[PDB]
A paper describes a structure:
The [name] bnAb lineage, derived from patient CH505, produced several bnAbs including [name], which target the CD4 receptor binding site (CD4bs) of the [name]-1 Env. In the CH505 patient, Env insertion mutations in V5 occurred throughout virus evolution, which reduced the potency of [name] lineage bnAb precursors through steric interference. In response to these insertions, over the course of affinity maturation the antibody VL domain shifted away from VH and the Env V5 loop to accommodate the V5 loop insertions. To determine if FWR mutations, specifically ones in the antibody light chain at the VH-VL interface, were responsible for the shift observed in the [name] lineage and breadth development, we performed binding measurements to show that these mutations improved affinity toward an autologous (strain specific) [name]-1 Env and heterologous (different strain) [name]-1 Env with longer V5 loops.
To assess the role of residues at the VH-VL interface on binding Env, we generated an Fab mutant, “I32M”, which consists of two interface mutations in the light chain of I3.2 (i.e., the UCA VLJL). The light chain mutations we introduced, Q38LV and L46LV, were based on residues found in the mature members of the lineage. To aid in crystallization, we added an additional mutation, Y32LN, in the light chain of I32M to create “[name]. We determined the crystal structure of [name] to a resolution of 2.36 Å and compared it to those of the wild-type intermediate I3.2, the [name] bnAb, and chimeric I3.1 Fabs. Superimposed VH domains of I3.2, [name], and I3.1 demonstrate that [name] has a VL orientation intermediate between that of I3.2 and I3.1, though it is much more similar to that of I3.1 and to mature members of the antibody lineage. Additionally, the DE loop of the antibody, from which residues 65L-67L clash with the Env V5 loop in the case of I3.2 and the UCA of the lineage, is shifted for [name] in a way that would eliminate the clash, although it is not shifted to the same extent as I3.1 and the [name] bnAb. As expected, the Q38LV mutation in [name] disrupted the reciprocal side-chain hydrogen bond interaction with Q39H, resulting in more compact hydrophobic packing seen in the mature [name] lineage Fabs. As with the chimeric I3.1 and mature [name] bnAb, N32L in [name] could form the same hydrogen bond with the HCDR3 loop, specifically with N100BH, which is conserved in all members of the lineage.
Author numbering:
A (entry chain B): 2 to 9, 11 to 95, 95A, 96 to 106, 106A, 108 to 209
B (entry chain A): 1 to 82, 82A, 82B, 82C, 83 to 100, 100A, 100B, 100C, ...
Write the structure that this text describes.
Amino acid sequence: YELTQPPSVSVSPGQTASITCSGDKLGDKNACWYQVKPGQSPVVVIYQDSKRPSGIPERFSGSNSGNTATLTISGTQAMDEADYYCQAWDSFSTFVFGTGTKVTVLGQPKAAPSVTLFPPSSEELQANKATLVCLISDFYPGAVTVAWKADSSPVKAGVETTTPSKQSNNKYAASSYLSLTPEQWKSHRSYSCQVTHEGSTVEKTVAP
Amino acid sequence: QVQLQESGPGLVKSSETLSLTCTVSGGSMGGYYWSWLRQSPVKGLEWIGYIFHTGHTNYNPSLESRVTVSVDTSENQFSLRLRSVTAADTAVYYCASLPRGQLVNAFFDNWGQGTLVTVASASTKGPSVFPLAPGGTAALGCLVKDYFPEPVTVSWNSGALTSGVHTFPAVLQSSGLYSLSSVVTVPSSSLGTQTYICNVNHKPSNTKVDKRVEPK
Ligand SMILES: [Cl-]
């Protein structure tokens, strides 16, 4: 089980970033927030809902009530770009963490992803196995969510998705794979790759 | 000030045991629970276990059966053993300090840098290559499935075709093997006219595969 955070929050330099963390009766607990940068020690930017450790800039503030804890950054700076994780206490697993929010401080204009979806090849099907291939390219910020649909029912098994990687043109690319049995592929009318970037969702669909 | 730094092996093979150690700088091993956590796209941020200098331990119930945390106060170090690792245990592993007190107010202050641990195949394997059949354009490609280790080199028409070629970064799948795709965007005016052949070079397994990509 986990606390719910938005996968990504992108701001231009100076805008306000608001990261929410949602859970059952979270407001009755104390939430803390971790700033995680690659290659560096994570730091506590807020503990006990709203307390700011010595060393942490005044632009970071925290709030918690109802079912939602919120981290606010105000006048977001480039150096604030990181993944933020919410955290609280849990009766069963001792600690419960948020799903994480990638905060991007825009260094270029946004770009929507180009998505291409491939069905399994005949050759792969003859070798029994079956793989659907969803390719995601030229998007910015480097944050995307990929959902697979079998007909119209969400697919929960056999999805492998890469971490977005920076292309030579400073935009990002990622790819997602759905592994199926041949009968699964031949049993449904269609499969779909749903790619959500920022707020918008583009869908691609293939059929037997 | 108290500083932490983890040490790790970098790359390990599936079914093996992962061993990490944290070296504590500054103060001594008292007043703190010494903890391990890991971070990955699939696991999110997750706590593994912590230990007191007296040896008292507490583990994450989802990891308890594979995990042992130990401490050596004479060396200002504590350690993690994670057994039977699979590709799913690929993550950045962190050591951290946990202040004494009510768990309801507990949080991890002071963290190490993190150490990346990749868990992958115990053996070299060459890829299977499959065709990905196709404004006024179309996308076609090749699927390069189940190889180890990196890298793979993909070219199109022996490298004479360069415009519109995009070869994607590999995914590390749960089996501990890699897969990638190479795709090329071409004029729809082609197809039936103009041949598209992907050349896949995987030198570690001494493998080279040529696949012709055609519309069905
Ligand atoms: Cl940038």
